[model samples]
Target chain A: MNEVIKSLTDHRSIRSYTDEPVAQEQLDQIIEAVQSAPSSINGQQVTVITVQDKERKKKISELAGGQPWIDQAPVFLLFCADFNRAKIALEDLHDFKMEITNGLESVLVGAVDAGIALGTATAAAESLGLGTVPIGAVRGNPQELIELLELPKYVFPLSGLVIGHPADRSAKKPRLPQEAVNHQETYLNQDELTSHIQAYDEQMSEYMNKRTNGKETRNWSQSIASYYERLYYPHIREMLEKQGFKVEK
Target chain B: MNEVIKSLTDHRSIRSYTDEPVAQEQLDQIIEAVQSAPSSINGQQVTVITVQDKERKKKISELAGGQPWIDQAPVFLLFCADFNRAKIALEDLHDFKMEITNGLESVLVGAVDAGIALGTATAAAESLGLGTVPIGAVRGNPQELIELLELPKYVFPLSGLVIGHPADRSAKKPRLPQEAVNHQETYLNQDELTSHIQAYDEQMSEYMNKRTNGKETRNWSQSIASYYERLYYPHIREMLEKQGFKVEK
Candidate 1:
């Protein structure tokens, strides 16, 4: 494989960071990667906040379910799905009345755009020999995060990526078998899918057991079951609404 | 910059494709890149359906508003925010009842995961000297796409990526100024934000005129003003509902 593909396929979340700082030049290239990600209609609805202060990172780490790695990482980057710019441009530059900036479609556009940017940034960091991890739990308590970041309405944090020099890198986790996730011309063969997943469950069981030093007993299916039995973050919609996102009545 | 970051920053949406076929080995590597993307809780809530069938690609191209390039591309990959595998695993493997697979958080998780996968896949394709363009309009007619692909509930198309040898590579589009999208500490300084966007509008205006042979006469702000004044794809939420997504009504 080429260097870019090698960087992507070899990706693993790095939760432990060394004292070595992520260089300012590498950070700039990562941010440039963010800027280069394709946005729908060139809407460019993604904004990033770089946090290096110890106190602020600690607070964010707490908000993100006490992931101390946030504090350890040299830089914590918050990627937000932002429409504030669009609204401002419409109202100020065009004198146009805006009505749909907070709707469900708008939220999806912004979030997807931000997700792509975050993904690209992660790859960029890895290419530069840095380590990174994405924090989806950043939305676990959106209100506090929003307040802490002073994010305006129409701008919501989709996810956070923590970057630094790696103290230790976790092994790459196994994924579902190709047959399970890759459909042919159309989705078909339920029985084959079931068998494929059953095998994946065993593979993940082995992986988790080894990763946790034989302490965790759950397979992929069992963990997914427990995780999805109830809503993980029930307040997501409410918080989106509170932040002025129209969830559609 | 390294080759990986260079490939990322040099990304341009390739809308024209030659008749050359994409090799199976290259496709597998691209899919592996998608499989390696990080997911929330390792849910792995993304599915890719590779469509190389001429008839199916033509139909999908028409469904995606006659993007024509979709058919021209050697392979058109439809990336779905899939929860069906998880739901099935929960019910079959663990026999755990799931009542929340279609909730707002679920959709967000699935879409964000899929977006990251798509981003990684794009990078992988570019690494192999191919080109790609993301089609957000895949959601334009979700029902037809779902029916055509026979997607089960809890598996919805988030977006599409058409990949092939580039017949014509478009110039990289300008993005919002760093000041406009990169906030330090907390989001503040509305005046600075306005000036940054003002400069971007001029840059985009120049780009648009040059790209379109001076046929288009709109700037960034004007284009955004018109785009966001109303809903682009009004049926998105309804389609989500029809596909068993709760969407927080």
Candidate 2:
């Protein structure tokens, strides 16, 4: 594979970071990558916050579920799904009752735009030989996170990516089998999908068990179901509503 | 800049495709890129369907607001925010009610994950000298899309990436100024943001006017506010609700 696709396929989340700092030059390119990412109708409904202060990073670390690696990472970049700019523009342009920001579609658009931008940031950071981890825990206690970041009403944090030089790099986690995730012409029936998972269960079980020295042997299905048993990030509904994102049309 | 970051920053939405076929090897690499994207808690909540049938692509083209480029591209890869696999795993593992998949959090998780995957796919395709454009119009008539694709509940299309040999590549659109999109430690106050955007408005106006040979002239804010006024895909709420996603829970 060429260098670009190789960089993408070689992705691994790096949770441990060394004391080395992420350079500003690298960050400029990463931010440019963010700006270059495509969004719905060029809406560009996203914002990124760079949190490097020791105290602020610590507070954000706790807010995102006390992940010490978050604190360890020298630069924590928070990507937010922001419609605030659009609203500001609309406030100046026309008074159409502003229901667009309130719709569930807004949330999807904002999140997807932010997600694409975050992906570009990761690829750019990694290409510069930096290590990175995506922190989904931004949704853990998002109300506090919003307050801490002082994000306005139509802006919400979608994910955080912590970047630094790597102290240790985790092995690439195995993904679901191709058949399970990639459909051709139409989606696979449940039985066909279950069988595909049956194979992946064993493959992932081996990977996890080997990694943990057999301390954990649960297959992928069993593992994820545990998370599904109880909804993770239950506060997200309240967070979205509180952020003035009305799911109700 | 390194090739990887260069590939990302050089992104342009290609709307025209040549008659040449995309190689299977390139598709394989693109799928690997998709497989390798990170997800929330490794939920891997995404699926990509390859739609190559001309009739199907034509149908999808019409469903997505009659975008001719959808039909013009050789391969239209539909990226879905998928929870069906998780729900199926839950069905086999336990019956503690599948509320997790119903929450608004699920939609966010699914869309973000799929978005990241779509981003990687675009990068990978571009790396192999292919071109791509992300189709957010999957939400335009998502219910019809779901029926046409035979997508199960908990698997909804988030975006589509049409990849092919480039017949023509659009110039990279200038993005929001860094000040408008990237906050240092916190979000900029509205006044600060508006001032930033005011500068971008002029910059974008210049670019658009030049691109259109002085015919079309609108600033960034006015252009996007036009989209915000309509809430583009007004059917999205009904689509999500019809697909078993409960934004309220």
Candidate 3:
């Protein structure tokens, strides 16, 4: 097996971290990894803020619905989808005449680019004996982070990442199998999708039960259902729109 | 420095490929790597189609603007931003009462997950002495691809990737510095942005000129300006909306 494959398959979200700070050089290489990841139309719309300040990380932790992991990690970087840079590139070369209207394409591209870059960073970090946990809840407050980070219009935080040496071991969670997710070319019908998930739910349940010593009762389907019932996704749509995103127009 | 960090910084995009077919086990591990990649809210809303059939590869290559290497790569995959799977999760646990919408947020999460997984796959492939290139232009005629792939509603093609053993060496390209994009917390002002570009343009120009033996005339700003002026992003948005993606309204 390839080393990269081995490293990735063995991935676990590391919430706890040693107090040692990530080297500036390691961070720089992570940025390089980000830049190298592919982008849509070569738009280059993602921006990463490598936050080193302990106070800011604590504030971001508060913003992420009190997830102390955001503060516990030695490095907390915010990944953003930024149409502002694209606009700047346009204006700088084209006599300052460009609009950053509902440029959701740029936004989506940035989100993906940022996500992939972080994944690359994760692999790179783990390969070097470091650990990471992605902070999806970081989207909880698009406005405050924007103001605190001084982000401009058209540049919105999409995700947060926490990294350090691992202090706790997290088990690798099993996933929905290939049959459930992979289709030859089209979306699978409900019958196909349901059937696949049914099988996966059993497998996932068995795996979770064994892994967690039956402390967690919910299967994949049940856990996700309960999760959605709380509507855990933050209501940052309004803040993003106020930040000039027009995500829904 | 960690070997992974060094590999990431020294990474180069490989455009050529040997005729070797990626092993079935390697493909399985890569798929798992993609699945294990983090998604916003753990939605895991993406599917990948491994194009092993020669005819399908040929058709995909044609759709991707006739990139010859697309058909030659041993393991060609299309990463789909999918919302259909979430519906199954909804129906399975909640008895179909929970409503699901494949809207903008769904689309964003799906694409982000796809990118993260695909990046992981690429890293793994490279670790095994394989080469890969992400095919962004595959979005061209995405409707045709949907038809060809038997895609369903709420699932759309975001990007394609070609992986195989190397046929030639490729060099790493220079990137704009973090100051050019990373802001303390906001977008850089016009003067600040301009100065950053000025410094990067000098570096990018030198890099490009050296790469092309001084024959090419394009610089960073000029290239980006022309791309924006061409409005290349519109084609993508139009396709997504047409495919039932409620992008921007």
Candidate 4:
């Protein structure tokens, strides 16, 4: 019930922002949050690129499916699951060889680090009364993003965060019921799963209807079905490979 | 700084825990924070299994390379990057086919969700005066864990969190200098990288020696090189493939 808990529970992705720019002081605090975020084995495998220029933001916005709000935000943070730095450190500082840096486990570890850092950054931004939205669509054109950001091998963009003052503070989006995601000591039984989904679909239906002014008639399952009926982004693995990740090696 | 910013900047992984048990009310709030954590496109591709039994904890301890704290913590929450439920939701409710649910992008997205949730859970628990440490070593023996937890296909363990009261609140661990990790419009050049690494290596060397009571003789670069000298766990990709994830396909 404190401010930290409040920020954690009341999180809603902010897409609309005011004209006010984010201050260096605020950026300092948020980036510190990222630096302090816990990493696996203290690997610190996350890197952030803060984009502020109009032209670069415009290019990133176009790459992220033309989300114009990206350009409007005062800063856009591209969080990368980066092992490139560690590889560099190993070779430069020591004579250690890295045969597994690009393997599947490395990618998972790096991405998780980036994700935790992204979450911490989000919390820090919200605590400072700044608005932000995570842009997963940045991966829709991963190669172009890599070129635009000049990202190197063993580094891949996991997500992006846009930050600025809030022009429109939207409603906090509802999540699946606790019972739905929070299994006890083990996963839920099929019957319980069905009942929980039934209840949650109704809740989501109500939420979507109200949020969309009754224009969106689909329920949660329907939306998921439509979304996953086919591959959303088919080239993710290829793009990762192009970025020097060995998916199977 | 506000309490939220303080909590964000003040995060440290808690390894040494007391015998005090975590309250059910506290667990509820922490789990709620996980539920509230944002997911990619609302896919909600994360599941948590809380373990408190002595036998299971002991088994997990062995699997995690005999990390005694695994058994000592009051509770161990195993976070999974789960697509099983979503696949079920899509198929059972709407009869939608999923050709992409097991792809590399799916794994990345799911693990990122789990990571954010883990981070949120950590923040929530810390805010409530509890201690937590993430266990990435859970993947050291992934097949054993999958069997022990009865995890289904498309549900892969990403990380674990051990939570309890802190027995020894160790000194806050230092991270890399801000200049090293936080890039401006692009990543740092080689000259900046070398300068930052030299500074951090010195700081880390001091911290490590003092933390080990002057027994250990290693710097940041040495520790990293030793850790990444080889694939820490070589069977990770095989485990993912067994869990129905197509890392290459």
Candidate 5:
């Protein structure tokens, strides 16, 4: 009902952007939002790297599966989940080292913190009339990204936010049915899942056909299934281990 | 700055809330924000459960380390990283099984998706003049929580957002310096890290002292250091595995 909620629901991913660069003031506002976003126990375990250089963006664009939006966007923000700061904090007072960094919780904490910051930054940018596309491809191959960004130990790149003036305003994508995604107290029953997914597949297929001028007609399940069939980002384990995070069975 | 950005930067975790019930209209808007939040590949791997029953909230309050805020808040929204819907989507067409469910990336995707939803939900709630707090302890002992919420496989609670009218207006806690967290093209070097962390320790120490009237003088490092060495949430590995998320070395 409010203006903010209206803007949020009206979200669209802007893949193409005008040649205009993001203003410093707008960037400042976005960064402010990230700084204020909540982190676990006030850990503030996120560090954002602002990349405007054409050369670096191009490299990142390639590393992220040649996504031209990374090269085209005027500002690319690499949101990193960082525990090096926490390491520094703990090392200052205690002789004890950080052992929590060796657990799956560490990975969850970092990614979740980065995710929250990315959401806040996206909201701030969109509210200022800028366009954004969240690039999860950064994790596709983070070794190069880590080196390119000179990310220290206990720090890893989880997501990227591409921002600039919009050249193309893609329509907002449809989400799963609210009842399915929004449960009352428990998860969806088998019967409810079967019904909702079937309905959504039809809805999404129609949307895709219209959006692509009948060139592509993959339904929601098919599109996601295609993605799942491939072992995308198989190196995530190697990347996490290389970054000194604990990933154990 | 725009209205939304202003609201985002002005956030403070409101743990204490009045007994007033959250209006259904406001709840709808918050859900709208979650529905609109971006997810990886439009997979929408997130489900939110609204828990308002006082009896359930009390049980959750106890389970989450006796944090009464869960019971005090008029609404408790559990943001779960959900692949169950994705499973439903994929199985509707392909005979191939969901292999990614057994990878750390799946865990990352779920947590990140849920985190993004939590941020969007928190922003929408705050914009409506409601107070909110994020609970991370649901993962502490999720076996019982999974049973309680009847969470299907591949759906794990990553974070919870409790919302209602503010009963207390706590001061906004300080964050690390921008230069420390907001890097340009690379991570902070050791020299910069040392100086910034020491300065932040002093800053946080002062804040804690002033807030507590000298009853507590622990600096940021000591506070976080205590947490880091404790190896909290030892069950995360077992829980993720139980939820069918891959955790491997």
Candidate 6:
């Protein structure tokens, strides 16, 4: 197999960590990777906050849905989909002539841009022998994080990324086959999608069965159904709307 | 003065390209970078379609809204936020089950994963001395892209990325000030965001005047208002819902 495919195929999630200090130099590279990502309209609207402060991280661990590993990680960073900077940048550049508006598109752009940057950072770190995980829990308590972080209007916490040394090299996780996912150019018709889905469900179920040693079992449909049944992130929509992102739009 | 930061801070968006063919080996590296990105819950639900076919590129360029560069580039990639894969994989692994009960949150994983991979591919291409640009225009005709790409269920065309040799080295665009955007741990409670925003408006106005040779003009507020004045990206929501995302709880 080719190197790219090899890297991708060999990828495994690392939730555990080892005791190692992530060098500032490495962090700098990761941050650079984030900035190099494409921004909507070259807006570069997002702002990255690197948290090396132990006390701050500890607080975040508690505030960020009590994810203890957040505190355990040697280095942590929060990538916010930022509009404050863009809002200010335009204010200065345009002499405050334009109207003020903050909407879902800008917020989504920031979140996605940060996610892109975090993804680049992950690859860079992994290439250098470091293991990492993105902390989705950051969204667990948006209000508290926003208040604690002192974030401004038009800016919101989209996600949190946690990076650290590899605690354990786990088994490779499964992904859906390309055929079941990739399309020719547009979306698939319902019938076509339903059939493709039928095939992938078995593939994933078999993998899950082996991975969990029969402790946990569920096909794709059931797993997703179970997930939605609890309505885990319903609060996020309200928070986003409250913050002025009518993202549901 | 770190190398990584240097690369990032000094990043210039390459608009033009050099006449060249990206070797398979180099392409492998770029794809590898894409695979190394972090995914939500290790969902790994993104689908990437790499198009090197000249004929296909031409058609995509037209569909991508008269972006001549798409036809000219050596590579065109379509990144889709795909939940269908997870759904399919689940079916393959087990028996029949409903794939998307969680709705937007589930779809969100696909979007985030795609963004991560897209950024990785861009960086990997850059590392190999190739230039790249992300084409958000794919959103212009989501239905068409879906039809063209033969996208499956639970897959939405979030964005398109064009990768190739640097045809033109563009100037490094200015960004908002660090202080104006970065927060400590939470969002601002009082008028802190507004005050900072006001300050940034002036700064942005100055940048715009210089960028436009004193011709172009727009403040942060006006720019946003004009853009979001009418709810944009209606298709994004429509497409997701049509794909059976069930976004509303």
User: Which number leads on DockQ?
Assistant: 5
The regions of model 5 sitting more than 4 angstroms off are none
Q: Which stretches of candidate 3 lie over 4 Å from their true place?
A: A99-103, A183-192, A228-249, B97-103, B182-190, B233-249
Candidate 4: stretches off by over 4 Å:
none
Worst 10 residues of 4 chain A by lDDT: A95-104
Q: Estimate each model's TM-score.
A: 0.97, 0.98, 0.90, 0.97, 0.98, 0.78
Q: Write the per-residue lDDT of candidate 6 for residues A91-158, one digit (tens) a residue.
A: 54344522223333444465567767766666666655677777777777878777777666666676
Each model's C-alpha lDDT?
0.86, 0.87, 0.71, 0.84, 0.86, 0.64
Question: Candidate 3 at residue B50, lDDT?
Answer: 78
TM-score of 3: 0.90
Model 2 misplacement above 4 A:
A93-96, B93-96
Candidate 3: pairs in clash: A149-B185, A150-B185, A150-B186, A151-B185, A151-B186, A185-B149, A186-B150, A186-B151, A187-B152
Judged by lDDT against the true structure, how good is candidate 5? 0.86
Worst 10 residues of 2 chain A by lDDT: A92-101
Candidate 2's DockQ is: 0.73
Query: What is candidate 4's local distance difference test score?
Result: 0.84
Sort every candidate by DockQ, greatest first: 5, 1, 2, 4, 3, 6
Write model 6 residue lDDT over B82-127, tens digit each, in one string: 6664555344434445434344555556656777777767656665
Looking at model 2, the pairs that clash are none
The digit string of per-residue lDDT tens for model 2 on B98-176 reads: 7776578888889889888888888889988999999988888888899999999888889999989888877999888
Better of 1 and 5 by DockQ: 5
State the interface C-alpha RMSD of candidate 5: 1.3
Per-candidate clashes, comma-separated: 0, 0, 9, 0, 0, 79
- Tens digits of per-residue lDDT, candidate 1, B1-249, equal 899888898988999999999999999999988888788888888899999999999999999999989989989999998888887888877788775664688878887888788888888999899989999888988899999999988788888999999998878888888778878779856788888889988998999899898998588988889888887777777877787778544
Candidate with the larger TM-score of 2 and 3: 2
